[PDB]
Design a protein around this nucleic acid. Sequence first.
RNA 1: AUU
Lengths: 299, 124
Amino acid sequence: ASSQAWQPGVAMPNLYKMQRMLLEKCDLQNYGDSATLPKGIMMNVAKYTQLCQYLNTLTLAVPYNMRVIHFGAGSDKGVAPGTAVLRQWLPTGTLLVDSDLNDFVSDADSTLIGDCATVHTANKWDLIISDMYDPKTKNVTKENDSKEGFFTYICGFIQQKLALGGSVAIKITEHSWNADLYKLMGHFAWWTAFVTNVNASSSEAFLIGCNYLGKPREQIDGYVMHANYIFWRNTNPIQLSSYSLFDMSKFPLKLRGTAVMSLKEGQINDMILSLLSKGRLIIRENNRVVISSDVLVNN
Amino acid sequence: TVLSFCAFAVDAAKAYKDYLASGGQPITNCVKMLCTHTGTGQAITVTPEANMDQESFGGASCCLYCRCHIDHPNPKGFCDLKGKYVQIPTTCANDPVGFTLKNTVCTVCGMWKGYGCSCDQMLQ
RNA sequence: AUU
Ligand SMILES: Nc1ncnc2c1ncn2[C@@H]1O[C@H](CSCC[C@H](N)C(=O)O)[C@@H](O)[C@H]1O
Ligand SMILES: [Cl-]
Ligand SMILES: [Cl-]
Ligand SMILES: [Cl-]
Ligand SMILES: [Cl-]
Ligand SMILES: [Zn+2]
Ligand SMILES: [Zn+2]
């Protein structure tokens, strides 16, 4: 649609989620084309700006003293452009932790260097962003199979460390995906695959889970849902567009002061699930936030 | 006797000025932010505050000490840029690291001295 | 994936 170019990106229409498509090659007519970016703006500043502009239209829970963790925050240039955008977007005072396999310097309150599998925390989080991508994914050796690696960690991290009512944005591509992550999208009140307009020439998308319910509201077959995602990308051509980057007046996340309360799985009734589904409640304690990265000691 | 260690002070700030004086390439990949350019124009802020004569950058990416992974000389070794946004005059946005090293912020108005601070300055 |  000509109207897509005026938005920060495009969300996968709901009718695609209800189909049963066969997996096929992802073939984009503009594959690899470069976006025209504003002067001196890095690709990931533009990309995270469009992701945050889209998250502004969803029912994100935004408590005071919000907790956000960003995985895959490092870059080959040693800086964290995505983290700088998240810090600009999130309310002042939001606790922001970022992590990456490789060393980098960032604006996060704390940074952990090492495989995400070495990251530990007993705390619950309000928002999880992952931009992780395994470089070996570029070497296609075994067909387009569901991938493990960091995806097994992020599935476990969502099921153990995401506050009920919390949300996630997990980066996937044609070959970088996991069937269990798609199944986990059914544990949210709502989910979608979002493509930024500055990267419309890539099979990249963010799987967005909005308002975690901690239980499956819809059973999703991950193998079929990835095939439906590729069918959408193959049939809905999205043109590169940097238009939304030029109006930043309404960029910061709105401070909703979402209620935070402590409840046991036994008190999570239908009235509470209704509040969680509307972005009006976060369930977790408000204990101090403690994180650690396991260090392997070799002689 | 940690004075023998400190006495030998490794001045990275002065070394960077000499490197630039020798026709050296300024540090790159400072993270420039998208913003309205209708901000206060203060030097270091919790959010981008660039006016029409400035560019806003992620602070950590414009700190020589953060980028070179060397101790901060600031009191208690804390960084004044990390976790904040630094406004750099557009005319110097090609070398944000050198700009933050060679310039200082006014404690009264929060503006850069010589690039926004008008405290040293009638008809009402 | 880090245009
Ligand atoms: N197992 C793993 N654990 C942690 N980080 C990983 C990982 N596998 C890949 N990554 C990281 O995923 C990143 C993909 S590129 C990320 C770019 C970054 N978001 C930016 O703002 O520029 C790389 O930095 C890579 O090191
Ligand atoms: Cl091109
Ligand atoms: Cl670390
Ligand atoms: Cl794998
Ligand atoms: Cl409570
Ligand atoms: Zn620093
Ligand atoms: Zn002043």
